[PDB]
Every structure is written in structure tokens, then in C-alpha cells.
Symmetry: C4
Subunit: 389 residues, 4 copies
């Protein structure tokens, strides 16, 4: 029947599952039509896992693929591939037009959501199975956008974080509550709620959800949103650890003040992710990623903690480097693999590939899951963008 | 069991679902074998939706693709693609040879129909599952042809509009009634029945069907056919609104006379489409498309009304422009997505692509469905036919 | 449960279903890897129909495709494609190595059979589902070979005609009786049994099978084999009609003597096919194909009769020309589409494509089924072998 | 329910099933993106058989395919293809990153295992369905590696041989016992246990497994490991027959001493394979492969015996040559096709293709199964590596 959160598979670290690298096949002499894309993420039903991403209505090599740097356009679609299929034209499935996306399976059907339209009056449409069952219009009229990673479904309701408002100022997130793709309520996020883009979300137990977000205007600390799906409420916090997770960021521990103090820098950011261990009642361990560099989007390093991230300033504990500091690392995303016996959470890593400013842009995706005792290996792309034809 | 019409999902406007644009992948350097095609449409079972179209036994780029402007030839086939698969050779499924097509799912099996043969003695064959169960010969011996959009199945019987006769004069439509692909009766269309090509058809309630057609000889107003599937009868009308839906057309409201008065121009036309909202007993709102231009096939504009289109001359109400007037827009088609709880109707738009008179010809397909409160965005192709290799 | 012959769908003629033409996609500029092949045929389960053929371990365009004229080699395999999929590399499924093939579904599993090995000691292996369950060795040690069209399964047993012996002399056919792919008996063909290659076989009622074969040494009349699956017996006849079906052949009616008189020419031949109408008790109409030319493999013409073909010399009745006499036509094959209500038989046509003697060789496949009242249209390829790259 | 070993299909020899040869499609003019690979093997569930192999994150033709000679790198993944699909990019499924692999189906789910990481601290991860359920770290810190052929599942537990330690000295194998992908015990291999790489494993009856391995340091005789899955024990032996199966090897019978005497040469080796006939209680016949040459990896020859291979020095009995001595032959692997009535074992042959030392490297795969009475035909590739583009 309905999907709900189970206790997770035992595991005390992150180890590599797989990597997809389509543009290895886009060199001189190759015969493949690969799909350049950005903002990828994975979502799973109990039958299959799928790689979702936002394409550009074009393949590489190809004469139109010079637009792949744009964030928003009439060409972008939420597409997906079965997880493990390489990212080629024939493997691709188009779900909805739009330039911001999310998707999640509720036990019976896929829900797909994208935002579509001009910056000042965009509309989120939600697709349930084959039908568009929901529509949610822009409420601040300034780039309505969503998670760029999977949403979370519990007991037949799916929970989606949207934000609308300036990228460099106050923009308030909302939680949309959907049943069969129709928006049946909006939860107001209380507490610390002046920012919260591109949230990566996971259930922390049977009835609660925790989202790790990006503050693009005010702070190098990541906002966190917790949802109590029974009470129907959501509260925002600021991640308190001295190990600041956003990029760019100042040195560790140097933001003076309370947990929820912004600090003086804070401009810019990148979507971050986390994974966890849990029982039916509570989360027992958390796993976090951030870049090697504190000013550029390069590298990826893993950390862990058994503390509550909204109320401890202790540094996180180092797991090790998953992408060397010389390698572009951009978004990362959380997801959960439902199982019959236990569930498992994972972090995906968008290893970025680009020829430069407003030139060809795409990525390779590496996946790490909660299992084992030590980090097993770092990941590379071995794709030189100059060699892409 | 059998498919029948349900009440529709709530919705008060048209919003974009998705777009397919295969020839974005047919530029210099690309690795894809795309499928040039015309007269596309979508039909759905409860498991899957499919994009149907008439191909030319060729792919683009390719040395034989210069024939894709022809309407009828021994090369054309009704093919289909899972909806969301891009239109490439490996994704294509061939169903029947022929140069006019339709298809619909009855709850248990696909029915596929095409017309095949020389202009003066063509034969419609109907395929049910894997077998050809029905054959219907030409009765006026002058291009037997059909809807170029999905047929409608109710309680195990499927209803198909055919026409046979001169393109610039009187040609009488018939309704074929099929059970498992075998033609078990013909309903005579009474009333206004001297034309009626390329009908887009939707159930208006539990037991009635309404088709919106093209008068190619006499009128800029669109013919409408209503079928009472219980009584086994069909009656033709002329759409009465001052907002004439065909192309070319005179200015709005300027056809003098009764509802069913032709007007003085009327030569030519294009296949049009509509969508609707309904309960089990009656249709509550209708949605219509026409071109921006009143003399060329360019642009697409949406309208709506709560009036009966066969008995009111009130202008329709503007929803907005879905394809800018500078963009070729050709056929459009209706279809319905069956759901477990509710059904949903949609309009697809054939955005035409061609190098010129008797040169390479194909299209991009944009899809809008009944949902939400306002139009979300217009569609473009960003394909320049000169760049197609 | 098990497959058995049902009464057929009503139909009094042959009308076109579809055509596959992969090498339309093998011209200059094309992006497809098409599969050159020969001896194709179709076989169906109740879920799906499939196009089987013998490939050459190569695709076109390609530097190794110059071997596709060979009849037998270590490169050839029995491969298949879902019926309606075009014949490209990614759509292909390899079943067994070998250079003579057949396949049929028994209601539960596919049986696949090929002959493999050197001319003087070849072995037929039979694959049932995923396993090789049967092996049948050469008994005359001179090119053991089989039908190159589907076999027939009745009540859990499948029936396969093999021949072994000189191509220009006496070679006796056997009927192999298989259960789950294991050869459980051999039926000796009595009567007229000195030749019988490449048999096209169809059930004539609930318990009998009729095969139409090729005499390569002695006669322009086609041999016919009837199998009584209950009694476990098979008897050979010579087709008696004045309308000789093989190529080359003398003029109609000019073979003097009894039904089973060879006539003076008779050297050479081509695989022919037939279709039929039947009830559970008896065959009511037969449909036959032969070439337009009486000396070359060009064109295809349809005929019918309600007579017993082993005991009447009446000419057959003309249906019309399905492939014009200027178009190469090579093998043709019978097959049957099982249905829940009724079955349907069909003829496929191998429209040959070649650059010349021991150069590139392949084909296009056109399909006609028993339905309707008149022939609907002839078929062409519009492939010029010189344009294949 | 659970998979367990059945009695095998009757058969007294090895006959060819099929061959996959993707790089036939990688010549000048071809349109295919083929997948260069090494260490392939086949594993089957009751629904499907699959070809597994270790890829290099690249396709051929292509500018990055010059790395395909490396044994271990961050690019390699365990991928698979449905058996009979040709080895192209669109057909490929990625399961896990890593450079040593194995996989087996337990009746309900696939288990996939790879080793990943640096030479001195590699980690085996095990994937069960969609989840990584098991992790097993390196215990000798010197290239943890596994079978490169299918594992064996009996009554819900799967058995995997791993080895860790020097390639030219003593390295002790362990048997990992897995349930739903989690390592629930390790069986210590007693007896002759100082080597044992790349084991090909088959059940010998209802409760016992026999593995045929490679001694890379000490002996031209192959090690054999037997597992009693009920008692939970494993014992190593040295294959005693005078017909030494490894490459390179001295002349037959010339190793002086007991069964378990190494002999004086013994350096180097290749993965070998075997097939068998069995009842529920015991193995009745064994089938073995080795190269034609006793110093190079070229050719393949089949043998059989009804003796116990750990306790008889009798020569094996010749079946015949499956790959001529002029053709590179590298790894071979065992696998078993589960059936509803009977099981069947087979040998696959990695026919190697390479341009030379540290240049492009891949293979063709030929498959032989236990059936029939005599060998049917030898296999070739007819791929000249110089012609690969
Ligand atoms: C989940 O966690 C929240 C917050 O700690 C708690 O209030 C709630 O009771 C928990 N749910 C269960 C089922 O224990
Ligand atoms: C459907 O509409 C027709 C025409 O308005 C009407 O006659 C018929 O009764 C309706 N059907 C139902 C089930 O109400
Ligand atoms: C099928 O036909 C044969 C030959 O005419 C006849 O002997 C047999 O009785 C028929 N089978 C049935 C079930 O009528
Ligand atoms: C399988 O073989 C082993 C070794 O010969 C034997 O001990 C065991 O009893 C056998 N199993 C069965 C079920 O006979
Ligand atoms: Ca920030
Ligand atoms: Ca008109
Ligand atoms: Ca002859
Ligand atoms: Ca050795």
C-alpha cells in the first residue's frame, strides 16, 4: 500500500554505489547522442529507481547544445532515465516542461512537479501518473522554484518545499501537501524562515521530515526545516555546527553569535545534501557533504554526527574526501531507497562539466550510500570539456 | 473492465504539460536518427499514453527524407511512441501501413485504424491487439480518410468518423461503430452533414460524444457532430459562435445569417481541436484553439465558453496565446487521459517545421491540458529548418 | 494453457497490414545501424508477435557487411525483433547461432531452433525458454536444414519439418515432434516424399497441419505435407493445380500427366507460402502467392481456391498483384496470429535488396493477412541498393 | 520461492548456443556505440538471463577508449545486458562501480557485488535489488578481488569466493555467505588453500558447491574448492588429472608427485571454467575447457570425465576443439540456467580482441551448453582489431 518511512539498513559511513558519465561518449568518433543536463537527482519507487534531471531539448554533440548554461528557458524539461541507464536520447523519458523540478513515488503512483512560465508569473504543475492533477501559481511573482531533489511521501501525502522571492533577500518557503498530485494544503514555515532554496529532504522517523536547504542571501550556515506530518506544521532552523556546509563560507567556527546568527558574509550558495540512519522513532546518525574549497565549487568532503544539528555547535566528524579539491563539484542531493525490510539513504554528487561562462554545461553524477565503516574511494570524471565535440 | 467516460478533474484553464521536439537532434554533428512525421495525435489506455503519427518510412538526417511533404504514398505508416519518448528510430513502433489514421483503447485492447490504397479505391483496415479484425472499403471512391486523432470507446464499442468525397465539395461523413476492431454498424450523420473532415472527438457525458471537425469547402465555421451512443444516432451542426475557429476565416461576427449559414468564403481549412470539463451528466465548460492569423497557419490562441456551441453566437472568452503569431501552427487534436478517479482532456499542437513547398516537412508537438486558472506559458520550437541536416 | 488452432476470423481476401524497411535508414547522412538479413518470418504468442530472421553478425553501413550474400557461415544467428520495431542493432535479440531457423510458441514458452555446423555434420539445437533442451543431428550429412518460417504447436507438442540431402536430388523430409524443446519422436513422411524444403505450415483444423514446400530438384509444382497430430502420421502430396506456384516454372497447365507427375523441368525453386480460412473441423478457403515472372524472382501475385489442392487441377482464382513484376520478390512465409476469439493467418513477403552477385544482400518485409473482400494495394520498397552506404 | 539446485537436463557433450560480437559493429562507416569490456560472465534468474561484464565508462569508437587494457581504475563498473542484446550503449545497465565483480539471483532478487577502492584498502559492496546491503573490507590489503563469474545461491544464501593477497604468492580465499546481500558469515577454506583466484562455481548436488579456480603462483593444476552449505564448511583441493587445465602449463602427466604436488613451474594463469551433469544427489559427468596452446592464451578445447577430479590422475577424454589454436582465448566462465523442470550448465568463452600492449582491449563471448552427443562447431570472431575505428 502507501509508502512510509522504515528503520534504515545498518551502516556507519558512506561508500560508493555507482557513477553515470554520459559525456565520456561525446568525444571525437563517438556514435552516441548524450543528454546535457543540470540539477539532477534520484527518486525511487519499490520497483525501480530513476535518475531525474532538467534537460535542454537537445543532445551533445549537436549544433543547438550551446544553450545548456541557462537556468530557465522554454526548452527545459524534467526528464528521467532508469537508474543505471546511461544518459542518451533513446533512454530518456520526458515528464513535464519546466525549469525547476521534483518527483516522488507515494507507493502507488509517481508524482512529478515542475515550475513553468515567465519569471514574474510562473506556475507549478503536478503530474500524478499520467494526469496533471495539481497547479500552484506564483505567490511572490519572482521565480517560483522548488527542491531540485526528490520530495517525501508519507501515508499517501507528499510534501514539497517551494520558495518564491528575491535570490539575494528574504524569500519565504512553503510546504505544499499533495494527495494524488492535487495541492490540498499549504503549511506555513515558522521560526527561521527568511530563506530556504533547493531543499534536500528525508524522513527522520515515522512521522517527521527534515530538509537541508540553501540560504542564498544571508548565511553560510544551512537552513533546516522540520515538518511534523501528523500535526501538519513546519519550523525553520539554522544549522548550528561550526562546520559550515555552504559555499562560499568563512573559516570553521568564526561566525560569532547564537546558533541562528547569520554572520557577516553569506552571499551566494549551492544546494547541499545529507543522509542518515534512523529507527522508527528517531534519527541516530547524520551524514553531511560540503566542498573541499571554501570559496569555489570544487571537491566534496563527507562528515558525520550523532548530535542534533539545530542545537549543537560541535564540529562534525571527518569521514574523508569523496571528490578531490581539483574537481568541480556543484549540487548534491539526498534520496532514499525504499526496501521491503529496511530503507537506505544516499547522497548524489553533481560533478560539473563546462567549457566556461555561457558555454556548454553539463555534469557527471556519483552516488554514495549509508553502508559500511569507512569511505571506500573518491570519484573522478576523466572528462576534459575541451574534448567534447 | 470496459472504458467509459468519467467526470473530469477540476480545472478552469489550459496549462502546458510537455513538448516533444525530435528535430532539435537533427543538426550538424548530431548522432540521432529522428522520425519526420505529420498528423500526430495522442491516445491513452489506463496503463500508458502514446504519441501516434504518420511516418514516411525514413529518418532525418537521411537521403530519402525529401518525400516528407506528401500526404499519401505507399511509404506512410501509422507508428507510435510511448508518450515522453523522443521521436527516434529505435523508439518507434509500426502498427499499420496507410496515410490516414486513428487509434483508441477500449479498456482491454488497442484498436488501430488506417486507410491504405489508391485515391479511388482505398480501404480502411482496423487492427485489434495483434489482429486485423475489420475492413471498411471506400464508398465514394475519392480519398477515404479519417480523423487523424484518437477515436472514442464507450462500453466496449469504439466510434470513428470517416469521410469520403471531394475535398472542395459535398462529402458526407459516417460514424463507424466497432467491437473488437470489427465494423458492426454505420451511423448515418443527419442534419448539417455535407462536410466534416479530421474530427477531434471527446465524450460530453456518460453516453454522448461530440466531434469538432473541418469544413474544407463551404465554411470558416467548424462543423460539430454529436453522437448518442445509446440510441445509435449522430447529428451534424455548424458551430455558431462569432469566434470562427477555422483558418482562413473572415473577421469575427461578419458571417451574416443563421447559425448554420456557410458564409461566402469558406475554402480551405485546418484540423482543429477542443477540450472540456464534464460531469457524468453534462459538459460544463468548453475550451477551443485557433490560429493567431486569420489567413495563415501561424500561432495558436485559446478560448473558453460555458455556452452550447451549436446554439449561441456569443463570442468565446479569451484565455491567451499559446504559440506566438510568428510561429507555424498546423493541426491540433483533442485527447483524454483516463484516470481511476477522474478523466482529463487535453489539446495537442502540431508546430510545423518545413524547408518549403515540396521540401522536407515535419513538426514539434506541444501539449496543454485542462487544469489551473490561467494559461501558464506559450510554446516555441527554436528549430530553424535551414539547420536540419 | 496450451495453444491449439481455433476457427479463423471472417475474411475473403488478403489486405496489407504493415511493412518493415530498415535499409531506408542506411543512406548517406543517416545515423542508424540497420541489420542486413535473409530468410525472415513471423511467429506469435498470445502476448506478442515477433519478426525472426537470420542475421550476419554485422550492421549496415559497416565495413564487414559484404558477407551478407552467404547462405551458411559461422557468423549467422537466428535473431528477432518485436513486430513493428524497425530492424536496428539496439532492437535486436540474439537467440541461437546457426544458418537455418524456425521458432514457435506453444502457449507457455518460445521454442527456437537453428541448424549449426559444417555442411557434412550439422546439428539442430532447440531452445525452450532460456535452455537448450533438444539436439537433433544430421542424418544424411548433407546440409541439415529446416523451414525458415514458424513451426506449429498443438496441445503442447510442436511440429518441425527438416530435410537433409542433396539440393538437386532426392532428400527426404522428416517431421520432428517436440515437447518443451526436446525431440520426443520423428514422424516418417510417406507418399510423395523425395523433396520438401522450406515448408510453410498452418493448421487446417483442430488436429491437422498442412505444409506447403519447395521441390528444388524435380518439379515446378509445390509439394504439400499433411500431418495428423492425433494419429502421429504425415503424408506428402504434390500440389495439383494448373497454377504452378514455384519459380521458375513452365506455362500454366502444360505439365502433362497425373497430379503427382513432376514434369520435365523442375530445377531450382523458391520458398512459397499460403494462408487460409478454417473452422474447427475443416479448411474452407486457401490463399496462395507466386511471382509475377515465371523465370525470375520478381513480383508477387495472390490467388485463392475452395478446392482441395492435392486433388483438383482447376486453375486458382486471381486476387491480384501485391508486388509489381519489376520488383524483386524472394521468399514468402505463412504465419498465424493467435487470438482469444479467433485466429488469423497471414503471408509475409521478402522483398529482396541486393547490389549483385556475392555483394551486399538484404530485404524488406511486407505483410498481408486474411481479411476483407478485395486486395487493397501493392507494395514497393523505394530502396535503390546503389544508395546504401 | 528460493532457488535451489535441480537435477540437470540430459546431455552428454557441449554444443553452441550463441555468440555476442559487438565490435563487428565498430568498423569504418558503422553507426553503433559499442561497449569495450573484459571479465564477462552470465547469470540467470528464472525470468531472464543476463550478460555481466566490467566496462570502462567509454564506448568504441571514441577518443577515450584507449584505457580499456587497465585491470583496475576509477572508471570501471559492473554493467549488464539482457542475454541476446548486443553490447551497445543504449542496452547497457550500470549496477555498481568497481573493478572485480560477481552476481547471482537467489529466487527473489539479484545480488550484485564489486570491489572498489585503492589496491591496499579495497572494499567489496553488495547490492541486493536496489539497495547496498553489505560491505566487506580488504583483510590482507593487497587487491581484494572476486570470481569474475556468477555466484551460487541455495535456499536463500549466496556463496562468494574472495581472495586477497599477492598475485605471485600465498593468498588465502574465503567463502562469504550472504543473505539479502548482507555478509552473515565467512567460511574458512581448509586443506589446500594457498591460492584460488577467479573461481567458476556450480552446485554438484542439492547441498554442495564445487569451484574451479586459478592458482596464479604455484601450479598449472587448477585448485578446486568444495563447499558443504549445510555444514557450513569449505575445503580446497588440487585438480589431480594429468590433463592440466591452466595456461601456461608443462606437458600432460609430467608433474611428478602426489595429486597435490605443485610442480616446478606454475607461474601465471588464466580463469578457467567447467560444466556438469547432476542428479539431486551427485555429479555424474564433468566437462572442462583449456587452451589449445600450452604457453599462450589461444584456442579452446573441451574434455570430459566421470571421475572425481580431486582423486584421479586419469587423463580427461577429448570432446574436441571449440576455438582454433590461431584465435585468442582468454577467460572462460561457468553458469547455470535454472528451469522449471531441469537445470542446465554452460561454459562461456572470452574470445579476446586487442590492438596490443596497453592498447585497445575487448572481447567476443561464445556460449556452449551441456546437451547432445558431439561437439557441433567451433567459433571464430572474424574481427580484425586493426579495422576497429
Ligand atoms: C518523530 O520525532 C518527533 C520529533 O522528535 C517526535 O515528536 C515524534 O513523536 C516522533 N515519532 C514517533 C513515531 O516516535
Ligand atoms: C448526455 O447528454 C445527452 C444530451 O444532452 C442527454 O440526452 C443524456 O441524457 C445525457 N446522459 C446522461 C447519462 O445524463
Ligand atoms: C481434421 O481434418 C482431418 C482431415 O480432413 C479429419 O480426418 C479430422 O477428423 C479433422 N479433425 C476434426 C476435429 O474434425
Ligand atoms: C551432496 O554431496 C555430498 C558430497 O558427496 C554428500 O555428502 C551429500 O550427502 C550430498 N547431498 C545429498 C542431498 O545427497
Ligand atoms: Ca550562503
Ligand atoms: Ca474552412
Ligand atoms: Ca522447383
Ligand atoms: Ca598457474
Amino acid at each position: 500500500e502507501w509508502r512510509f518511512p522504515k528503520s534504515t539498513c545498518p551502516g556507519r559511513s558512506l561508500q560508493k554505489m555507482l557513477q553515470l558519465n554520459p559525456h565520456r561518449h561525446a568525444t571525437a568518433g563517438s556514435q552516441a547522442a548524450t543528454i546535457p543536463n543540470r540539477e539532477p537527482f534520484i527518486s525511487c519507487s519499490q520497483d525501480e529507481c530513476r535518475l531525474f534531471t532538467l534537460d535542454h531539448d537537445v543532445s551533445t554533440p549537436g549544433a543547438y547544445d550551446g544553450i545548456t548554461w541557462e537556468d530557465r528557458s522554454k526548452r527545459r524539461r524534467l526528464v528521467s532515465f532508469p537508474l543505471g541507464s546511461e544518459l542518451t536520447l533513446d533512454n530518456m523519458k520526458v515528464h513535464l516542461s519546466g525549469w525547476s523540478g521534483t518527483a516522488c513515488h507515494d507507493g502507488k503512483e509517481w508524482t512529478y512537479a515542475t515550475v513553468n512560465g515567465p519569471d514574474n508569473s510562473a506556475v507549478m504543475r503536478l503530474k500524478y501518473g499520467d494526469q496533471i492533477r495539481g497547479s500552484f501559481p506564483s505567490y511572490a511573482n519572482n521565480i517560483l522554484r522548488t527542491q531540485e531533489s526528490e520530495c517525501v511521501c508519507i501515508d499517501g501525502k507528499c510534501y514539497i518545499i517551494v520558495i518564491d522571492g528575491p535570490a539575494g533577500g528574504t524569500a519565504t518557503p512553503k510546504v505544499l501537501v499533495t494527495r494524488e498530485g492535487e495541492v490540498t494544503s499549504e503549511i506555513i514555515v515558522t521560526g527561521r524562515n527568511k530563506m530556504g532554496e533547493e531543499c534536500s529532504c528525508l524522513a527522520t522517523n515515522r512521522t517527521w521530515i527534515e530538509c537541508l536547504c540553501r540560504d542564498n542571501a544571508f548565511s553560510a550556515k544551512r537552513p533546516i526545516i522540520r515538518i511534523d506530518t501528523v500535526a501538519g506544521t513546519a519550523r525553520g532552523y539554522l544549522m548550528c555546527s561550526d562546520t559550515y556546509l555552504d559555499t562560499p563560507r568563512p573559516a570553521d567556527g568564526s561566525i560569532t553569535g547564537s546558533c541562528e546568527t547569520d554572520g557577516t558574509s553569506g552571499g551566494g550558495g549551492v544546494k547541499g545534501a545529507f543522509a542518515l540512519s534512523r529507527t522508527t522513532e528517531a534519527t541516530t546518525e547524520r551524514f553531511y557533504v560540503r566542498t573541499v574549497s571554501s570559496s569555489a565549487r570544487s571537491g566534496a568532503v563527507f562528515y558525520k554526527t550523532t548530535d542534533d544539528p539545530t542545537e549543537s555547535n560541535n564540529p562534525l566528524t571527518l569521514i574523508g574526501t569523496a571528490v578531490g579539491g581539483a574537481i568541480p563539484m556543484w549540487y548534491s542531493f539526498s534520496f532514499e531507497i525504499p526496501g521491503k525490510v529496511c530503507d537506505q539513504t544516499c547522497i548524489g554528487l553533481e560533478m560539473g562539466l563546462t567549457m566556461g561562462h555561457q558555454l556548454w554545461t553539463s555534469n557527471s553524477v556519483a552516488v554514495y550510500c549509508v553502508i559500511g565503516d569507512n569511505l571506500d574511494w573518491d570519484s573522478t570524471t576523466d572528462v576534459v570539456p575541451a574534448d567534447i565535440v
